[PDB]
Point group: C2
Chain length 315, copies 2
């Protein structure tokens, strides 16, 4: 109940501390980092940049990140373990599928996909023994037949293991409502689910209604506006004011290299947000305190809500 899986092994949830629940070391494609590391300068250069960035985040307060990179985002859990250790920042790895499944994933059934997700949660990723601590799913605004299979497999895996589900969403298409209906149709409890990229919208009724059902709300792309970001942050305040503090999760959706986008967008992002993953502790947290948000409510959001979210719970 009280044990989380990280790339360095099992920890107790009290050690997780302050947690960023939607991040990436590298946004890529399956096999790509190993086949073409010099797209990132080199693998060594990429690991060093992530270590520097994670160390700055740790200085600013962060203890744990959740790397929500799936198989098809090029998750390299060996890289995650190397940089977690050098930075001394906990990293939770993910299973699931994002928006770029290859044929060998697109053609699988819900049962087969369920077995794959259970493999990565219960046995380990590839040949590393590193077990995922969260399931990441991505859908387009209107859920495709394959993405619905992914959703159902995520729910079945989450129910067999208690590990949570976190989603990629088109918030401006109310993407979370269709995901929730599918997930609930599988008997998945909403307190096991986080509707992500939920800060890309003004629709507070959309945001407030999912929280009331028990969903976690991911305001995980605040710094991306800064390429205003306080309008996005003010959604955290708006939700606290409606009484849904136990339902907010905040993050940067940052990364230190990206190949699944046009070339050189990493440098435009870094010179737009020099703070990287430190943006949440350094710029958002004090902005919220300076609107009268109690220090204690923030610790609940940045520490307590992620701990409740990640604890394997058959409930």
């Amino acid at each position: 109940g009280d044990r989380i899986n990280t790339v360095r092994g099992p920890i107790t949830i009290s050690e997780a501390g302050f947690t960023l629940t939607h991040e990436h070391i590298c946004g890529s494609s399956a096999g790509f980092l190993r086949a073409w590391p010099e797209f990132f300068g080199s693998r060594k250069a990429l690991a060093e940049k992530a270590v520097r960035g994670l160390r700055r985040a740790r200085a600013a307060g962060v203890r744990t990140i959740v790397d929500v990179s799936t198989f098809d985002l090029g998750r390299d859990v060996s890289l995650l373990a190397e940089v977690s250790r050098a930075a001394d920042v906990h990293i939770v790895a993910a299973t699931g599928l994002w928006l770029d499944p290859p044929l060998s994933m697109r053609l699988r059934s819900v049962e087969e996909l369920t077995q794959f997700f259970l493999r990565e949660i219960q046995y380990g990723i590839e040949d590393t023994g590193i077990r995922a601590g969260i399931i990441k799913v991505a859908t387009t605004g209107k859920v495709t037949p394959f993405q619905e299979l992914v959703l159902r497999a995520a729910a079945r895996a989450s129910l067999a293991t208690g590990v949570p589900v976190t989603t990629h969403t088109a918030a401006s298409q109310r993407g979370g409502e269709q995901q929730a209906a599918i997930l609930e149709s599988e008997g998945l409890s909403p307190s096991r689910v986080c509707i992500g990229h939920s800060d890309a919208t003004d629709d507070l009724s959309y945001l407030t209604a999912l929280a009331a059902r028990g969903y976690l709300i991911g305001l995980d792309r605040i710094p991306h506006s800064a390429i205003s970001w306080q309008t996005r942050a003010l959604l955290i305040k708006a939700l606290i004011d409606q009484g849904y503090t136990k339902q907010i999760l905040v993050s940067n959706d940052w990364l230190f290299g990206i190949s699944s986008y046009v070339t050189n967008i990493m440098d435009v992002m870094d010179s737009g947000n020099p703070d990287g993953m430190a943006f949440i502790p350094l710029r958002v947290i004090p902005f919220l305190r300076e609107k009268g948000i109690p220090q204690e409510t923030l610790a609940g959001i940045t520490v307590t809500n992620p701990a409740r979210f990640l604890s394997p719970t058959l409930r």
Copy 2:
């Protein structure tokens, strides 16, 4: 110069022997074999099946295969090296891209794709030091804009290294004609190019015209008609011989020992339809052609001489 790179290192062209120029150990997707080996039972079970299948081909006279699995077909050159050593069959590895490129590939420029294909030929694949000895390219319909980028990057990598290009085509759409036009626009000699999956048509004049331009003609899915008869497809070999284009013919099975990039259990369907596997060409097509009057010097030219000329890196 007269050396061909394999997954065990360089070999001289005389070492290649009887060569199957379009084959696969495993038809999969990037990262998939290592993330989900149990899809194939296990990595060990897949390797053992491939060793038996390659040993069966070897006993039917095969000495080399060209594994034309790209990055996005889940090529695992460590697996190819293991099974090559256990079976004593040379395996040439491929660079290039097939029809399932992930986003990190689809968003690259022709200049970036060129660098990737060059790295796999000149430096090595992943961190294994195994260098590709062929560039595989697939297109559909009229070539998509991205596929044209791959075609041009392949031409540029070939022109820099002398390594040949081999293609996946839809022959029923005469897909080789657009491939040839794009490659020739880059300055690539047709003698460096094998237009593959060419047996899946009856349009002999389409094939003859490409051969007349100096393209190699890949007649590589004959066993797939065995579940048109495979003998009908095999007569395209004799037809090209009779027009005097024996030099342009490459024959293969397009077989594999595991496949994840299709519906589950298709491998059982393929194996029961073609129990010969990669031995289909030597055990069935070669005898059939002999019985139709093709002499041994011609069959040895097709299966030994043609692949050696094709694979030997050449800037001429």
